[PDB]
């Protein structure tokens, strides 16, 4: 999986990325000098929680292309933008690490937060690393950073082992927090990067982000270890906390720089606690929107009120048995068969506790579609567009074109254990079919 | 629905026909001067029994074309042949009436009985109507038939009422066996025929069928009323009985010529009793053939023996509950999921007593087809060819081309209350999918 | 080289694969946690033997994509089917290893053996690894496999060193059968796999293949090690041998799990012996089918019996003098000049006795083609079609759609070393020219 | 970035290549068994000097495809030819190492020197490694190389740690000239290559390059380590020096075989010096012939002396400003506008120090000339031909068949937006224009 972001000479600067899981998109940006695979402990906990994980490799690092141009944060942000535009992500979360936090703060400032719901800064560079007469809160003068760039160009392979010692604090963490095999992969990941990228990237560490911080309007999370070597805490996060008081501030006690692996228990705990508090407001907004499209089919009366509460208890998570429900749903005087099917459909997508034994006939004949071959031949063409679809905003848009007949049969395909798509796009088909009946 | 059988000048001699029901094809041939609609009392009882009824209108009569050529039994038989070839009927039953019996005996003699399982002769012309020095068993000399032909050409409309009096014996049956409204339709049917056909057809009544009778090798039924006017019983059926002793002989007591309507209770009773005795031998031959394809998937052992008896009791009609069966079918050690589905599929097609409430998941996931969009897109193309298919010999032939993957999903379409086809072609898909696993 | 076998979100699940050599397609399926390059010792042996090696990487492993969906043998077999269909293979031999033996039995029991000639099971998973009350032939209970997954999730990179120590039995083979450099490479491939793929794979180890074994209607090979630490021989091959007795059972003495590298000498010898014992019956009644068309051109007499022995004493595997035949075929009274070049061509392919010098003249003047540009331009048309051909039938079905004069010129280039084809393709041309003389 | 250079059955043979920087193209070809990333020190100095660095990985090595066919220098040269043509490199430089030095001599011999300006052989194989009876100056008999292939086939990975041990002289240069980590990565690059490649490549070492040496008609550079253990200097560079005495000969004292890393500070110094001289000679040789053509358009007198000086001063790189020239050129008594537009078009090319400013106005007005409907549209016909033409003589020959009104108009197109083509092709138009107006 590759996304093109640039064009160097006769080649195209392509970036490696991975799009896993279904739900709220969480974009992860790695640090120097690793790949997107470095988030393998965080990506694990984000998948079990239900989030959609998207990790991409920075140019010159990992499996991405290795050009000798475009090594400033204006290019690094222009790449992140192209990725978000190509993926068409909406209300996503940007989580950065090391250099990754430098793109999270630059993109937000330069392109806005129309696609952003929340951000996070793990072991950040912000606001400034370079120590000048202007900024005393710097970590080191430019002579120091020029000492690193030269030390890479001499022998970048021998430079890595020294760097990955101040990355994990191996004299304290090896054999306890991190194994030597785990370290080896990090070296293998770094050594398999672009030689030019390894020598040009350190010149971006001392970037002035003081102008980009105020442009953060979305909820933010700031995290940093108290034993960081590459990025001293009192020169970064401690003074990042004063620049943006709106963000929650978390110091992991005794954590090194590469705290993504060493303190995975601590990081994942805080990262999930932040997301489930800053995304809860929008994650249920669909549940009341899906409820809206569903209720716009039910004829007004005593039924419409109880049905709406059979959606409230279910969407929330209250215990509801289907047998009393589905029986009751069938024997209805004013409900047309087609609505019985949609309700029977939605009531199965939202609960994993249907006992997994029986199916219903009143819905199965409702989501039939008469049995017309042409009507079925279009329904599978929709499912084809839905099996390669991800978002609710996209599944509804596509399934609003096809006729009301093909929509019924397409819902049947998913319901009759034939086709299979995520519950987020399943609502899309439902809410699109509901707009047809309006 | 029309079938072309000839070509007159700038027009094409097309014949009207109707193909209703599913099962053993029963071709009905009307008499003079009606349409295929005259069998509406017989077609009713043949549909409730489960037979497939096919009624076509003779040339110059009914809604068929009205040419002024081809009015001999060599042309009338050549039309019946073309119809059977176009419809590709196999092991069908030919049932004739009045002139209709003249085509049943001529086709069999001139074209054979490869497509014929049994025949019937209701109020037949056989073996000879014309009284000559050669044949004393005739009904009338040629002077009589020439008296009718002239009486038609004078005023065929006024000739009908006289004919439809000796057709039903209205002085005995009107207001009792047949209503005057029922008679009116017969007149309307006759008057809406070809004027040339009404005047040329009587010249075919005195045809010598004595050479065609010995060529009857299939089981035959001979029926005739004892009050027939148009065709005296002692000149037709009584001497037809001596020519072909193999055929069962039935005299309806006090029945007129048009005994298809007057004595519908008697005719239908004898007609069904004959079919269910002369078709029982082949109607279950498929049941042991379908059983053969089904058992060729089951791994040899103690299961294969019991499964085979779960097919014997079911195909025969013995009481079998699905809940004990389907539960038992699921929890199987050596049965692969795909075979569980086929058995679960067949066990639902053959019994109308599944209580109509629940469905099974072990089969529903077996006849899935992985969920591949291309695999589903081909499955609906098969169902399209099956929804316009009629025979078991044709459904199997078509569903042997598509891959084993598309066959599974196509079986799912029928099982999951989406598509709908007759149980005769359903076995075709099953037996074709079974040959794939061999 | 890649093959799209699915679609996860906005990414396409592609599998890495390689295709070398000419002859019978031998597919090699690796196991946990290596890749297609682990067969490198077997691939070198199969290429020299005269086969066609096709190795591919499982999803999430090796150089293929690393998705989070589709980690079960129903999905693994769906990929294998797509690879087999995309390449359009016929008479293919399926060889598996560890986790790769499960894809061989699952595909063979769901998609058929149309493209399969034989199968092989090295270090099998069959028939059941999980130990319940239903079978004592299981390896370990569910509580054990949960320990593995938890160990992978803890430290994926540290898990390998403890896994590869029991993979090759390094307390027995290190420094002898396998060097530490070979271990490091096996680790480098396991580390570059998928993070989700490495933890969701051991849950597929205890898959039940008992319902897939009787579906194997092709010659099989059950090989195992008597010192396997990962897959206990008593719980796998020992009971697999009873479920599949007509399969050549081979136990490599003192062999570990990673016997592909340690006991490569013992495996290759046993694998090549099976590839000959299973494919000998098909080469016979093909080589005699080749001879059948060859002897047809030979006039029925005392010469058609001599040339029969001159062929059957070469097809068997014996050696002979090329000079003797090319002087006994040259100076011959009854044979036409064309059928001299034909026999001279068949011999030049079936003989290993090169003697290392110059190439005959009379066959050149026979397979000349009159030096006609039109007839010789049609000759290169077949060569381009035969260079892309594989089977014997595929070559004969194309080389029969050309003039017999053009086939001579086409057998000229292949002879004159201006064009190169295989063995079954070459005979497909010759046995087509022979068909055009009847 | 990949380039297709062939086809292997179901798979395509692609080669991984990189393109960096702007300037004179320098093709770097690696050796056994590394990849293009082995030039990461030479590819650094070349970029800092102002060259265009192009590294491609040989088949079976690096990230390129791993086929089992075409492991010979006839195929390797074809691979290089395909890469050069696909990239359409003009006046490039070929630099090879170990095996790469064989692909330089073979290309020039078989394909020519139209795209090549200069070549370089670093630690070369030339002329013949195999020690035969007619070639006393060999290195080892065929019994030696056959021992290496056998050594690799036994254990490919364990073989490397002994090869790299002498490749770098790690008993002399380890932890000093080359780091331990630098070795490990080179081992990873080796282990990630084609298994068949590592066994087939050593057989290509003893290739006779004596048939390729005389074909070299371009400036060459023969550099070789004095302490080369793998490739003896006395059996290669010394004898190679006699076969091509025209080449600048350089011996780096105490350098092993892998002197690209250990002695990068010496190789970069020599390679840059050679390039900055040999290329400088071509930029002077084929620049004084331009003056010859220009000084045929200018009437004899002081203007044929003042322009001559101002041309020879500019050609010599003497610091001057165009605004003195471009104005002094304008206010000139004798010269016509056409020859005032030609001179200005040369001064813009031969003086890169353009103050970083605009173009001129009088040259734009004089160049187009008339803008004749067909003659201006016959300038775009030549513009399509010169973009494909690669040489100076080639550009001269084609444009000599066009009118001076078309050449001037074509020069007007190039001047506006250049370019596309190169200066060696642009001068091919200027010299052709001057040749016409005579």
From Swiss-Prot, chains A, B, C, D:
<dbReference type="InterPro" id="IPR050471">
    <property type="entry name" value="AB_hydrolase"/>
</dbReference>
<protein>
    <recommendedName>
        <fullName>Non-haem bromoperoxidase BPO-A2</fullName>
        <ecNumber>1.11.1.-</ecNumber>
    </recommendedName>
</protein>
<keyword id="KW-0560">Oxidoreductase</keyword>
<comment type="similarity">
    <text>Belongs to the AB hydrolase superfamily. Bacterial non-heme haloperoxidase / perhydrolase family.</text>
</comment>
<comment type="function">
    <text>May be a chlorinating enzyme involved in 7-chlorotetracycline biosynthesis.</text>
</comment>
<keyword id="KW-0614">Plasmid</keyword>
<feature type="active site">
    <location>
        <position position="228"/>
    </location>
</feature>
<dbReference type="InterPro" id="IPR000073">
    <property type="entry name" value="AB_hydrolase_1"/>
</dbReference>
<dbReference type="GO" id="GO:0017000">
    <property type="term" value="P:antibiotic biosynthetic process"/>
</dbReference>
<dbReference type="InterPro" id="IPR000639">
    <property type="entry name" value="Epox_hydrolase-like"/>
</dbReference>
<dbReference type="Pfam" id="PF00561">
    <property type="entry name" value="Abhydrolase_1"/>
</dbReference>
<feature type="domain" description="AB hydrolase-1">
    <location>
        <begin position="25"/>
        <end position="263"/>
    </location>
</feature>
<keyword id="KW-0045">Antibiotic biosynthesis</keyword>
<feature type="active site">
    <location>
        <position position="257"/>
    </location>
</feature>
<keyword id="KW-0575">Peroxidase</keyword>
<comment type="subunit">
    <text>Homotrimer.</text>
</comment>
<feature type="active site">
    <location>
        <position position="98"/>
    </location>
</feature>
<dbReference type="InterPro" id="IPR029058">
    <property type="entry name" value="AB_hydrolase_fold"/>
</dbReference>
<dbReference type="GO" id="GO:0004601">
    <property type="term" value="F:peroxidase activity"/>
</dbReference>
């Amino acid at each position: 999986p590759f996304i093109t972001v640039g064009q160097e000479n006769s080649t195209s600067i392509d970036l490696y990325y991975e799009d896993h899981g279904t739900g709220v998109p969480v974009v992860l940006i790695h640090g120097f000098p690793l790949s997107g695979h470095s988030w393998e402990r965080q990506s694990a906990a984000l998948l079990d929680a239900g989030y959609r994980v998207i990790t991409y490799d920075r140019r010159g690092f990992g499996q991405s292309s290795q050009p000798t141009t475009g090594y400033d944060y204006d290019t690094f942000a222009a790449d992140l933008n192209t990725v978000l535009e190509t993926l068409d992500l909406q209300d996503a979360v940007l989580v950065g690490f090391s250099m990754g936090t430098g793109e999270v703060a630059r993109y937000v400032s330069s392109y806005g937060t129309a696609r952003i719901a929340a951000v996070a800064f793990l072991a950040s560079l912000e606001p400034f690393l370079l120590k000048t007469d202007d900024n005393p809160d710097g970590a080191a003068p430019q002579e120091f950073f020029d000492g690193i760039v030269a030390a890479v160009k001499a022998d970048r392979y021998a430079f890595y082992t020294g760097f990955f010692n101040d990355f994990y604090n191996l004299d304290e963490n090896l054999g306890t927090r991190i194994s030597e095999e785990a370290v080896r992969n990090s070296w293998n990941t770094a050594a398999s990067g672009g030689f030019f990228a390894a020598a040009a990237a350190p010149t971006t560490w001392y970037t002035d982000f003081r102008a980009d911080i105020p442009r953060i309007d979305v909820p933010a999370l700031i995290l940093h270890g108290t034993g960081d070597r590459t990025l001293p805490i009192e020169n970064t996060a401690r003074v990042f906390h004063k620049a943006l008081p709106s963000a929650e501030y978390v110091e992991v006690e005794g954590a090194p720089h590469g705290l993504l692996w060493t303190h995975a228990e601590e990081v994942n705990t805080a990262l999930l606690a932040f997301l489930a508090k800053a995304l809860e407001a929008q994650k249920q907004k669909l549940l009341t929107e899906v409820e809206t499209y569903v209720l716009s089919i039910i004829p007004s009366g005593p039924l419409k009120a109880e049905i709406a509460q059979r959606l409230e208890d279910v969407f929330a998570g209250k215990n509801t048995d289907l047998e009393v429900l589905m029986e009751w749903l069938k024997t209805r005087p004013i409900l047309s068969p087609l609505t019985k099917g949609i309700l029977g459909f939605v009531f199965t997508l939202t609960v994993p506790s249907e006992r997994g034994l029986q199916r219903r006939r009143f819905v199965q004949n409702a989501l039939n579609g008469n049995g017309d071959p042409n009507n079925m031949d279009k329904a599978v063409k929709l499912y084809r567009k839905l099996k390669r679809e991800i978002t609710f905003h996209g599944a509804k848009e596509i399934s609003l074109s096809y006729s009301a007949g093909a929509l019924a049969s397409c819902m049947g395909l998913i319901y009759n254990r034939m086709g299979a798509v995520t519950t987020e796009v399943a609502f899309g088909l439902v809410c699109a079919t509901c707009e047809q009946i309006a």
